[PDB]
Amino acid sequence: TASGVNQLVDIYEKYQDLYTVEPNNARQLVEIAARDIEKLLSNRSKALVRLALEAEKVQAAHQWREDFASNEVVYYNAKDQRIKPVFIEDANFGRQISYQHAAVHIPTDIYEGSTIVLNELNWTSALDEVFKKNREEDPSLLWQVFGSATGLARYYPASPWVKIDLYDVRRRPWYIQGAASPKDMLILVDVSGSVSGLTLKLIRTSVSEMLETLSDDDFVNVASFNSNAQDVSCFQHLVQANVRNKKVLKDAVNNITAKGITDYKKGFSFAFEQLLNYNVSRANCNKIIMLFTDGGEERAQEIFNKYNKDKKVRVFTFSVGQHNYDRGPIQWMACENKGYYYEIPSIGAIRINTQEYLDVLGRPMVLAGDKAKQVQWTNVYLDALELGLVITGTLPVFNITGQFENKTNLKNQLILGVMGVDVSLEDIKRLTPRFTLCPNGYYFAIDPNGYVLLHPNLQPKPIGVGIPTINQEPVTLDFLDAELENDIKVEIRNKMIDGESGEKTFRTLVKSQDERYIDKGNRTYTWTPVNGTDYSLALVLPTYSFYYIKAKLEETITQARYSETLKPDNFEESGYTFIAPRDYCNDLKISDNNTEFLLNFNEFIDRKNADLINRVLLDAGFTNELVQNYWSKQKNIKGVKARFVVTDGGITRVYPKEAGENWQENPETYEDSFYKRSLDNDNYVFTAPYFNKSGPGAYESGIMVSKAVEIYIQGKLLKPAVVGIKIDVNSWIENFTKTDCVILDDGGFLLMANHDDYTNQIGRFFGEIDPSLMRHLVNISVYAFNKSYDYQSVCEP
């Protein structure tokens, strides 16, 4: 009676016009979104290709000057002959931009004006023209970066660098992805008595700073030999170097101690055995062993002749520490195999040495002329210029000095570096318009490794690992770890990775938007691969989201009264009115001052994406009609503290105009928990307020109710809006009294308990009130539970 569900249904029905219930095909939509994202990535790939060719061409003709005192090189250092820039405070990046000269970022420990940096700056000064050409032939392109292999970083939109600047382009994920092919490392940390002391600390730090340089598609393990080749971890084979396994390996390395007698033969035999463990799903290429040792005197010739006969493996060796032992065997080991020998005197040399093996690993791909010029996208990762979540494209640029002269006797087998472009996930999130879907639907895409990309539960902050401690890693959520995991969904994940395109339907569980409920529901999936790249876009529609209410309007008078309907001055007679933040053609987004956004909307509509505005105004009109017809008439029913209605678009109306002052729900209805849940279920749903909140509630707000207004417009189930009442707690407590009686809901939240002490603590999860009763209640086949994991959350300890 209070909300008046049938009243809203009749209001919708009587206006059979003003509607066009188009069906979300759920396959054509997926295909078109896939094509659009592929087109975007193709634009970026084209920009990368042209930049790479230009860089190669310009480098080819440099002449290697060596006297830069005269004809000084002019550039703009980021950490500010330097240039004096003028910055346009463009809103695309959220910081300062210039658009007329490419900044530079020389890492702190590199000298500004050496004989190598200066040459890099000169010969890259030609890249500015092509940068401008790229950014001009199509705007909305965020960053073009050039991580040359000398520490530089020439990114075109010149902004001041974002305190000790530790950035070093040769270590970023988007550089390693380009500089080398995947790897199968095996770090032979030398924990023998000869390294105890400082050298052990250097070994542990170096191993950590090396594991920092492994992507998610290249495996790793950490052996250690002291006359016995144990494993510092619990793995015993290669483990994919996720963001998590890296944690275990780092902890194991940190908790290591020297002992025993050095024995290279046994350690290397064990290592080469571990690289022949083909039945553990290894990455079959770049079989690498990277021995960490102080110094040795026994070159294990026998083992290198038994195994690695065909030079399959690539043995690198570091003579870490400041010592005086023989470095002959180590150099010979690095030389005989297709390896390379380093030296780590002390901290400070770790960062610039552990990353150098990529230069060696790039030799085969350089020797393969253009078979490697393939744009290779990375996995999501927070920007380095506080921009958000961006995936990067990479395209290595080779060194052609003597090409077409055919000298082929030079250092022509090394890459200049990697030149990459960044795509904001906020720019893929507008090629997948979620608004036409119901609040339950959404898109998502996955790497071939399964890690998500463009997923609603992908919050922008680093993925956490392990419990915190008392005192840059990519954001990689596995698609099963972003949603509830059951038997069926794993099949869908497996079928997306292979690229098989298909459709599936079933009944499953969906975690509520506030992480306090679970609901059964049907979710007609959909998945196709984007032929351009290695991704498989998906789309999850419930069974009632197939059709959406599009709005068509031409009178200019009906939309007129709809437009002045929701004016802030009409709240007293039309109730409060939020508006969700939705990107109109050019309207500025919300600054969480919903009133100011509403005023801006008023001005824009007074002046004059059109469907979105059309349909939000349609919802405004219908909600006004409902409230004025019924809510205004039967004002202040006995047990109704506040009457509220939520629709799509963002028209949230709360009648009293005072409860709106106590309306904690987000204006974006697609993010309101009760809306999605109320849509999912088929009965009134009660959402107990949280307990011990800073703000008020549960006595001056009243518990909430909701019931989606199902519609039969022409024989199709639609659920546009949701209506409910914040039932006053006191009157309903009286009603309860007139009948230890406890009223409870799924999620174990006390809506009531006759005992007066309990009802004071209304809304707490029952279970910290009388545990044993629930503990047994779970036992009798009611109140099951699912104990999932959240990988993005904040803890104080």
Binding site: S181, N286, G339, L509, V742, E768, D770, S772, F785, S793
Partner: protein, 92 residues
């Protein structure tokens, strides 16, 4: 890595009853679901253990030593440029 939890109805049955055996004692409960509504009504006896906390709390993820035994399906790239004969091994 917190650890969320949720509780929800399993069976379609509406009436539930039994006895609670906290310790050397008995209690009476009768559970009834308000039909056409997401609510359950129960009547426990007067008061006379270990708290359930549905609120998420910090913890560690799955024991990685376990999931590595049966790692999730994964299809890596298949280019991996390496093993080229025309390579100069004269660096060291």
């Amino acid at each position: 890595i917190t650890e969320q939890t949720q509780y929800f109805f399993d069976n379609d049955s509406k009436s539930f009853s039994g006895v609670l055996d906290c310790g050397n004692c008995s209690r009476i409960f009768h559970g009834e679901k308000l039909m056409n509504t997401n609510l359950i009504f129960i009547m426990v006896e007067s008061k006379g253990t270990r708290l359930l906390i549905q609120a998420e709390q910090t913890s560690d993820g799955p024991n990685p030593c376990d999931m590595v035994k049966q790692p999730r399906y994964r299809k890596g790239p298949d280019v991996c440029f390496d093993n080229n004969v025309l390579e100069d091994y004269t660096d060291c």
